[PDB]
Design an enzyme around this catalytic site. Structure first.
Site, mmCIF file in Angstrom:
data_model
loop_
_atom_site.group_PDB
_atom_site.id
_atom_site.type_symbol
_atom_site.label_atom_id
_atom_site.label_comp_id
_atom_site.label_asym_id
_atom_site.label_seq_id
_atom_site.Cartn_x
_atom_site.Cartn_y
_atom_site.Cartn_z
ATOM 1 N N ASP A 1 4.406 -7.733 -1.806
ATOM 2 C CA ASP A 1 4.595 -7.374 -3.196
ATOM 3 C C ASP A 1 4.913 -8.546 -4.109
ATOM 4 O O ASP A 1 5.809 -8.443 -4.953
ATOM 5 C CB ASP A 1 5.726 -6.320 -3.289
ATOM 6 C CG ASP A 1 5.334 -5.037 -2.576
ATOM 7 O OD1 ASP A 1 4.123 -4.889 -2.320
ATOM 8 O OD2 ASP A 1 6.186 -4.182 -2.261
ATOM 9 N N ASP B 1 2.583 -2.814 -4.825
ATOM 10 C CA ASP B 1 2.860 -1.496 -5.393
ATOM 11 C C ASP B 1 1.730 -1.222 -6.385
ATOM 12 O O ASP B 1 1.425 -2.070 -7.207
ATOM 13 C CB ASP B 1 4.202 -1.408 -6.099
ATOM 14 C CG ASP B 1 5.369 -0.957 -5.244
ATOM 15 O OD1 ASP B 1 5.178 -0.496 -4.102
ATOM 16 O OD2 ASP B 1 6.522 -1.065 -5.721
ATOM 17 N N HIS C 1 1.095 1.724 -8.673
ATOM 18 C CA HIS C 1 1.611 2.992 -9.154
ATOM 19 C C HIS C 1 0.836 3.623 -10.308
ATOM 20 O O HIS C 1 0.365 2.972 -11.235
ATOM 21 C CB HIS C 1 3.058 2.817 -9.625
ATOM 22 C CG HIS C 1 4.077 2.499 -8.584
ATOM 23 N ND1 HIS C 1 5.025 1.507 -8.774
ATOM 24 C CD2 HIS C 1 4.342 3.018 -7.364
ATOM 25 C CE1 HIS C 1 5.817 1.425 -7.714
ATOM 26 N NE2 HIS C 1 5.417 2.340 -6.840
ATOM 27 N N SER D 1 9.181 7.328 -8.329
ATOM 28 C CA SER D 1 10.304 6.383 -8.237
ATOM 29 C C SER D 1 10.827 5.994 -9.607
ATOM 30 O O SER D 1 11.850 5.315 -9.754
ATOM 31 C CB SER D 1 9.861 5.130 -7.467
ATOM 32 O OG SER D 1 8.946 4.375 -8.255
ATOM 33 N N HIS E 1 7.272 0.278 -13.326
ATOM 34 C CA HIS E 1 6.925 -1.064 -12.874
ATOM 35 C C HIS E 1 5.681 -1.105 -11.998
ATOM 36 O O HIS E 1 5.424 -0.154 -11.253
ATOM 37 C CB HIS E 1 8.104 -1.650 -12.085
ATOM 38 C CG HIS E 1 8.381 -0.976 -10.783
ATOM 39 N ND1 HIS E 1 9.053 0.224 -10.686
ATOM 40 C CD2 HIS E 1 8.088 -1.329 -9.506
ATOM 41 C CE1 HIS E 1 9.158 0.581 -9.418
ATOM 42 N NE2 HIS E 1 8.576 -0.351 -8.670
ATOM 43 N N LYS F 1 -0.085 0.292 -2.274
ATOM 44 C CA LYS F 1 0.672 1.449 -1.784
ATOM 45 C C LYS F 1 1.273 2.260 -2.929
ATOM 46 O O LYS F 1 1.362 1.810 -4.071
ATOM 47 C CB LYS F 1 1.790 1.026 -0.835
ATOM 48 C CG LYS F 1 2.252 -0.398 -1.016
ATOM 49 C CD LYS F 1 3.427 -0.782 -0.147
ATOM 50 C CE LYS F 1 4.027 -2.101 -0.636
ATOM 51 N NZ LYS F 1 5.516 -2.031 -0.639
ATOM 52 N N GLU G 1 5.738 8.204 -1.963
ATOM 53 C CA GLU G 1 6.716 7.130 -1.894
ATOM 54 C C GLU G 1 6.309 6.177 -0.776
ATOM 55 O O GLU G 1 5.809 6.625 0.256
ATOM 56 C CB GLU G 1 8.110 7.696 -1.652
ATOM 57 C CG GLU G 1 9.010 7.793 -2.869
ATOM 58 C CD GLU G 1 10.161 8.761 -2.672
ATOM 59 O OE1 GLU G 1 9.912 9.918 -2.265
ATOM 60 O OE2 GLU G 1 11.318 8.363 -2.921
ATOM 61 N N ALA H 1 11.090 -7.394 -1.797
ATOM 62 C CA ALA H 1 12.438 -7.885 -1.644
ATOM 63 C C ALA H 1 12.860 -7.743 -0.176
ATOM 64 O O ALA H 1 12.515 -6.764 0.472
ATOM 65 C CB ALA H 1 13.454 -7.138 -2.499
ATOM 66 N N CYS I 1 11.265 -3.764 0.583
ATOM 67 C CA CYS I 1 9.916 -3.694 1.144
ATOM 68 C C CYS I 1 9.707 -4.711 2.250
ATOM 69 O O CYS I 1 9.001 -4.464 3.233
ATOM 70 C CB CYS I 1 8.894 -3.890 0.023
ATOM 71 S SG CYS I 1 8.761 -2.462 -1.084
#
Length: 179
Positions: free
Chosen positions: A9, A51, A53, A59, A70, A93, A100, A128, A132
């Site tokens: 990420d 990510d 999204h 989330s 984000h 993802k 999630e 992080a 993740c």
């Protein structure tokens, strides 16, 4: 190939100045790029997770989740901040409104792709650490991969959580190295 680098990420919204910034997350980008270059020279498979999204993801705060909006699909915040080779595999993802997924393995084809390319050992870097990166490293372990953590190319949000995650990962089978 036998080894794969997995870049977790490394996106605009997780760096300083982004919507969900990792403290000093930008400081690991040179070393992250250097590992990519290195692994790419060695003919290893390069994987980059992101990510990806939709608007109003579960989330997000707007649906009562813990995070502000984000890394939304097709927005600057979801852009990579690392230099990836053309042949990098991209893993997106958490693409559905209710799906999630902290781990790069969760709801993705990551495991099958890895085994389909003959991978036996994975190297994890990114952000992080306590979120993740740990989830992805722990899932890599689940699926029987030999897992290494690149100590100087990971970064988390609070040091004590960071330390915790690194210790936990090591106690479970994850090798922490740098080079």
């Amino acid at each position: 190939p036998e080894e794969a680098l997995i870049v977790v990420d490394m996106q605009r919204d997780f760096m300083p100045g982004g919507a969900l910034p990792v403290p000093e997350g930008d400081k690991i980008i040179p070393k992250v790029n250097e590992y990519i270059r290195k692994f790419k020279e060695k003919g290893a498979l390069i994987v980059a997770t992101r990510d990806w999204h939709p608007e109003n993801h579960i989330s997000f705060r707007e649906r009562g989740g813990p995070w502000p909006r984000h890394c939304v699909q097709n927005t600057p915040g979801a852009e990579f901040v690392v230099d990836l080779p053309e042949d990098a595999v991209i893993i997106s993802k958490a693409t559905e409104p209710d799906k999630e997924a902290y781990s790069g393995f969760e709801g993705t084809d990551l495991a099958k792709i890895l085994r389909g390319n003959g991978v036996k050992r994975v190297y994890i870097c990114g952000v992080a650490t306590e979120y993740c990166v740990r989830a992805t490293a722990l899932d890599a372990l689940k699926h029987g991969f030999e897992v290494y953590l690149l100590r100087d190319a990971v970064k988390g949000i609070k040091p004590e959580d960071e330390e915790r995650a690194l210790e936990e990962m090591k106690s479970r089978g994850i090798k922490i190295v740098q080079f």
